Design a binder for this molecule. Structure first.
Ligand SMILES: CN(C)[C@@H]1C(O)=C(C#N)C(=O)[C@@]2(O)C(=O)C[C@@H]([C@]3(C)OC(=O)c4c(O)ccc(Cl)c43)C[C@@H]12
Ligand SMILES: CN(C)[C@@H]1C(O)=C(C#N)C(=O)[C@@]2(O)C(=O)C[C@@H]([C@]3(C)OC(=O)c4c(O)ccc(Cl)c43)C[C@@H]12
Ligand SMILES: [Cl-]
Ligand SMILES: [Cl-]
Ligand SMILES: [Cl-]
Ligand SMILES: [Cl-]
Lengths: 194, 194
């Protein structure tokens, strides 16, 4: 079939949904595209090259809320961006693990830059603004990884039914809010003992 | 060599530090112990059985702060427990990924139970107390996974030097505090609009 970057990646993502990250190989990607292994190598050198490309494309394709709207508060921005990141990671099987394994990308670097400007304009230092964006990312990554992996005593028994009744979204959205408020309390305090 | 559970796991953890999770196989575990593959199978049926056992032992061995001290506040407990969890996950190469892949364990279930009682005594519902413990865990897991994987424009350039100067600990400890305060603000509010 056709072997430009876009088609290769469409085929690799679709293969990702069939096999998961551990299962995904170039040899099976070559089968799906109706081509021999050495043809594929011209286009994609190894699994690691494939996964880096996949990590960037999952976000380009689906991480739709990467930038603040006109007028938007920093709280609201961190919320919408976390929700969008989460959703993009959930869209493909082992999506979170595909993301974790990769350093960020020339275009992802101008987006995070704009975010860091945004947070500085709203009164964060570079430091505290970086800590805020990192905490959000790490919390989200961790929640999604746990959700994607999974799928007694009393209190637990009831506990692990309120966590199962849902796919993890409620637990995530509540913790998101706790995190944002915690940042707000940090920020608002300036140099007072908080 | 000697093949009781303790020695097998000591050898598997030491092998873990040489190869990482993707590299670790029963066949290499058998080599390290000076035994043939079918001897090992009697003791450990597969990689998945090995990893589940490893996940439980990393925590038994090193997650020293699993329970509150006499008198301790819930804030302080969540802090010390997060720090302890983080440290135990960092102690072995791919430690976080070994943990993520496993459901919890008969003894881990009585510990989380005691935690959930602890949070209820200090005024959390089961729900909100579960959300708090989960958020802490997910944040910590995500921070550690990112730290273990890793090892331009201006603001970033300065950003990714304050994140590198350290191993991730400062970013983690700051976000930890933001999370705990966020919970405190939730809890204290009761039914008022917060
Ligand atoms: C979820 N958002 C908060 C961010 C985002 O919109 C991204 C996009 N597109 C990311 O890559 C993110 O989701 C993301 O995972 C990266 C993350 C960040 C701060 O940017 C970095 O350059 C960087 C780094 O070099 C090491 C660790 C971390 Cl947390 C980062 C920025 C994230
Ligand atoms: C870091 N601590 C906060 C906890 C802890 O002390 C543990 C131990 N030992 C865990 O297993 C923890 O670190 C941990 O990872 C588990 C986690 C929890 C709530 O307990 C569960 O039974 C459970 C579950 O079934 C699904 C998701 C989650 Cl987050 C959980 C409890 C964690
Ligand atoms: Cl074609
Ligand atoms: Cl072509
Ligand atoms: Cl011996
Ligand atoms: Cl023996």
């Amino acid at each position: 079939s056709r072997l430009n970057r876009e088609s290769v990646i469409d085929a690799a993502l679709e293969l990702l949904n069939e096999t998961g990250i551990d299962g995904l190989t170039t040899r099976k990607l070559a089968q799906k595209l109706g081509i021999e292994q050495p043809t594929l190598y011209w286009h994609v050198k190894n699994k690691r090259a494939l996964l880096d490309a996949l990590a960037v494309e999952i976000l380009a394709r689906h991480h739709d809320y990467s930038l603040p709207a006109a007028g938007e508060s920093w709280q609201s921005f961190l919320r919408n961006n976390a929700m969008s990141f989460r959703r993009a990671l959930l869209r493909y099987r082992d999506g979170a693990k595909v993301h974790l394994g990769t350093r960020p990308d020339e275009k992802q670097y101008d987006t995070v830059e704009t975010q860091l400007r945004f947070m500085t304009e709203n009164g964060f230092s570079l430091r505290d603004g970086l800590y805020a964006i990192s905490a959000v990312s790490h919390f989200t990554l961790g929640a999604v990884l746990e959700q994607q992996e999974h799928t007694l005593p009393p209190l637990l028994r009831e506990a692990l039914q309120i966590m199962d009744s849902d796919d993890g979204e409620q637990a995530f959205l509540h913790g998101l809010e706790s995190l944002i408020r915690g940042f707000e309390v940090q920020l608002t305090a300036l140099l007072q003992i908080v």
